[PDB]
Ligand binder design. Structure first.
Ligand SMILES: CC(C)CCC[C@@H](C)[C@H]1CC[C@H]2[C@@H]3CC=C4C[C@@H](O)CC[C@]4(C)[C@H]3CC[C@]12C
Ligand SMILES: Cc1cc2c(s1)c(-c1ccc(C(=O)O)cc1)nn2C(=O)c1c(Cl)cccc1Cl
Length: 240
């Protein structure tokens, strides 16, 4: 019963913070940037595409923070542990969330109101990183994640008692074990335990996210965006 309540409260936090509705993303699959619109994005300055992408990624991060803040027990952790878990996992969650807005049939992503391929981002000059982000979304797309699966799986991406630097490791372990039981219970109930052998290897998500954040840091160093900072303790760890 506590476990059914936890499934309900994780799914509710996800629903309130998912940013884009799955029904909207699936309906808009036929709404694809024209050749003319793609060329318009490619001709934009590296620095304007950077400003647009940095602002979208900031907002995506801020929704993952509100998601974490609404997870049962997260706000009862010490601030040090909250920041450790968000600093390690918030961008891993953004990259997982991306698969909902990715169409494997044509290798497009929902960006600024329509679907486009990775060639939309040509001006940024990051083709190998962007290709690795699209390939990651392409792998995840094969799971056909349900909304509840993405919610419980992303909760576990964040609530990981193995992150270095935790001060109350036993408190994070308690949350982790309850979220693992919630997730395994839900998969059993839905006859979806077969996704467990297909989830990304932990190291893949960590290295891809580490490369992504390092690229964002390089862009931010060369051309700082102004951030609407909502979570000062976490902002202070990423920006300088
Ligand atoms: C490496 C940097 C400079 C470039 C990254 C380019 C691409 C991969 C970025 C730029 C804007 C990003 C999107 C911004 C917002 C969201 C909404 C979120 O709900 C899921 C991920 C998603 C859909 C992001 C996917 C990745 C994305 C499309
Ligand atoms: C694990 C994390 C990575 C990451 C986080 S958290 C944040 C962030 C954002 C907002 C707040 C807040 O207080 O509103 C707090 C944190 N930005 N960010 C980045 O990689 C990033 C981005 Cl998205 C854009 C430009 C430069 C950079 Cl470095």
């Amino acid at each position: 019963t506590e476990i059914e309540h936890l499934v309900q409260s994780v799914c509710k936090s996800y629903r309130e913070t998912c940013q884009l509705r799955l029904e909207d993303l699936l309906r808009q699959r036929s709404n694809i940037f024209s050749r003319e619109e793609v060329t318009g994005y490619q001709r934009k300055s590296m620095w304007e595409m950077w400003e647009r992408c940095a602002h979208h990624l900031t907002e995506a991060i801020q929704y993952v923070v509100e998601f974490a803040k609404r997870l049962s027990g997260f706000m009862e952790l010490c601030q040090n542990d909250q920041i450790v878990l968000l600093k390690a996992g918030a961008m891993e969650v953004v990259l997982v969330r991306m698969c909902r807005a990715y169409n494997a049939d044509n290798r497009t992503v929902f960006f600024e109101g329509k679907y486009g391929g990775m060639e939309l981002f040509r001006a940024l000059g990051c083709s190998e990183l962007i290709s690795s982000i699209f390939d990651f979304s392409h792998s995840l797309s094969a799971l056909h994640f349900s909304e509840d699966e993405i919610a419980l799986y992303t909760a576990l991406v964040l609530i990981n008692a193995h992150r270095p630097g935790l001060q109350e490791k036993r408190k994070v372990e308690q949350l982790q074990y309850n979220l693992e039981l919630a997730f395994h219970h839900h998969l059993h109930k839905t006859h979806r335990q077969s996704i467990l052998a297909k989830l990304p290897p932990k190291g893949k998500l960590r290295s891809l996210c580490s490369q992504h954040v390092e690229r964002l840091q390089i862009f931010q160093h060369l051309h700082p965006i102004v951030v609407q900072a909502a979570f000062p303790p976490l902002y202070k760890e990423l920006f300088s």
